[PDB]
Amino acid sequence: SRLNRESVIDAALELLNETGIDGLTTRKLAQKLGIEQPTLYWHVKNKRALLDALAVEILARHHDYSLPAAGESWQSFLRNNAMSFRRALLRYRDGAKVHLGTRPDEKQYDTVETQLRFMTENGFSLRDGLYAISAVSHFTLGAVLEQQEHTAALTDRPAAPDENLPPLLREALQIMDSDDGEQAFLHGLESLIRGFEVQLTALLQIV
Amino acid sequence: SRLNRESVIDAALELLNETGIDGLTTRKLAQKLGIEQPTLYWHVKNKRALLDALAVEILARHHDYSLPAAGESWQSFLRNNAMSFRRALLRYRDGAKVHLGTRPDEKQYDTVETQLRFMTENGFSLRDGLYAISAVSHFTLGAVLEQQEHTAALTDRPAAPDENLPPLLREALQIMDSDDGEQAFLHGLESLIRGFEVQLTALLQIV
Ligand SMILES: C[C@H]1c2cccc(O)c2C(=O)C2=C(O)[C@]3(O)C(=O)C(C(N)=O)=C(O)[C@@H](N(C)C)[C@@H]3[C@@H](O)[C@@H]21
Ligand SMILES: C[C@H]1c2cccc(O)c2C(=O)C2=C(O)[C@]3(O)C(=O)C(C(N)=O)=C(O)[C@@H](N(C)C)[C@@H]3[C@@H](O)[C@@H]21
Ligand SMILES: [Cl-]
Ligand SMILES: [Cl-]
Ligand SMILES: [Cl-]
Ligand SMILES: [Cl-]
Ligand SMILES: [Mg+2]
Ligand SMILES: [Mg+2]
């Protein structure tokens, strides 16, 4: 079919969403596209190339809160940004796995510069701003990852009997599985943001 | 070679550390063990079985701070536990990927019950205790994941030119790569723990 960047990415993203990160192989991508492998190799040289581009395009399509509103608090911005990041990562199977270990792409430079600049404008050093942004990303990535993988592990094998569970775990597990991970994520998110605040506002005060 | 659980796990863990989660295939495990595939299948039925058992055994070997010291603060316990979790996950390649989406194993029940109980003894509801423990796990998993995958992505392809970078990103990237991720992790960890505290101690007070 069509082999421009957009369509290769389209198809890869579909393939990723079907079969996960394990099924995103250049052989299987060729089959989806209805092409031979040397044809695909002209456009895509290897899996890592593809993963990097999927990471970028997942956010370009589905990460709608990359930048703060006018006069937005840094706390509101991080909260909205994280929610948005999470939603984007959850949109495709292994979406979070695809992002891991990437660094911002040239197409993301202005955006991520603005984010970094905004944190500094709000009282953070670059370093402390970056630590906050990293922490929010990492927390969100792990939350999504554990959600997405747990759901995949369910399809493979079942959990063991309820019968053997000690009571707080048994209850913990019901809570965990009472939603998709969203409640615990939002709660963790506010914790995290408030700790940044405690840190920012302490300035030199031992805190 | 020997095909008891311990030795299958030994060899899988070696295989995982060599070739990562992609190379942990029952075919390649058979080759490492020097056995035929039907021989291996008797002991290990599929990849997910193996992943679950590796998740458990990684912590059994290398997660040394699972339980609080006598009279330890919950804040100290989370900090020490997280450090310990991180160290365990970083010990093997894709160690964090292996953990994702698991739930506690029967062999971990007493431990994780004690952890849950301890948080409740320290003022948390089960639910808020679990949200704190989840948040600490997720943050730590994402931190480790992004560290481990970034290092793998380096071996594949290089970062693009420094030349095009806007200045705060350029600086951010040096900071990020000034250590293995540890400084940012520890900083994020204290933020997170202090936000739990703010939340715990607020009780009913709007906070
Ligand atoms: C500042 C970026 C950065 C800087 C240095 C090293 C890095 O690895 C990064 C990132 O990876 C970032 C992202 O991935 C973003 O998700 C990122 O690229 C992104 C975006 N394109 O809008 C975000 O919304 C960010 N958000 C907190 C989840 C986040 C970035 O802020 C950083
Ligand atoms: C309470 C456990 C739990 C409860 C309900 C659903 C879950 O998925 C879990 C976990 O997955 C936990 C872990 O993985 C631990 O890492 C876990 O199993 C573990 C351990 N074996 O010592 C830890 O140190 C924990 N730590 C915060 C990283 C953590 C556990 O507390 C939880
Ligand atoms: Cl074309
Ligand atoms: Cl605001
Ligand atoms: Cl044997
Ligand atoms: Cl203490
Ligand atoms: Mg990133
Ligand atoms: Mg776990």
With a CB cutoff of 8 Å and minimum separation 6, the contacts of A207 are A198, A199, B194
CATH architecture of A1-65: Orthogonal Bundle (1.10)
At what resolution in Å was this solved?
1.9
> Per-residue b/e over B16-40, b at no fewer than 16 CB within 10 Å?
beeebbebbebeebbebbebeeeeb
Contact A135 B184 (CB under 8 A): yes
B26 lines ligand 2 (CB under 6 A): no
Contact A188 B49 (CB under 8 A): no
With a CB cutoff of 8 Å and minimum separation 6, the contacts of B41 are B26
So where are chain B's domains?
1-65, 66-206
Beta carbons within 10 angstroms of residue B90's beta carbon? 18
A127 lines ligand 1 (CB under 6 A): no
Contacts of B142 in chain A (CB under 8 A): 137-143, 145
**Distance in angstroms (rounded) separating the CA atoms of residues A139 and A189:** 8
| Long-range contacts (CB closer than 8 Å, 24 or more residues apart) made by A163-172 | A164/B106, A164/B109, A165/B109, A166/B109, A166/B110, A166/B113, A167/B113, A168/B113, A168/B116, A168/B117, A168/B120, A168/B126, A169/B104, A169/B109, A169/B112, A169/B113, A169/B116, A171/B126, A172/B116, A172/B126, A172/B130
Residue B1 CA to ligand 5 center (angstroms) comes to 7
CATH architecture of B66-206: Orthogonal Bundle (1.10)
Beta carbons within 10 angstroms of residue A73's beta carbon? 13
Ligand nearest to the CA of B7: 5
B59 lines ligand 2 (CB under 6 A): yes
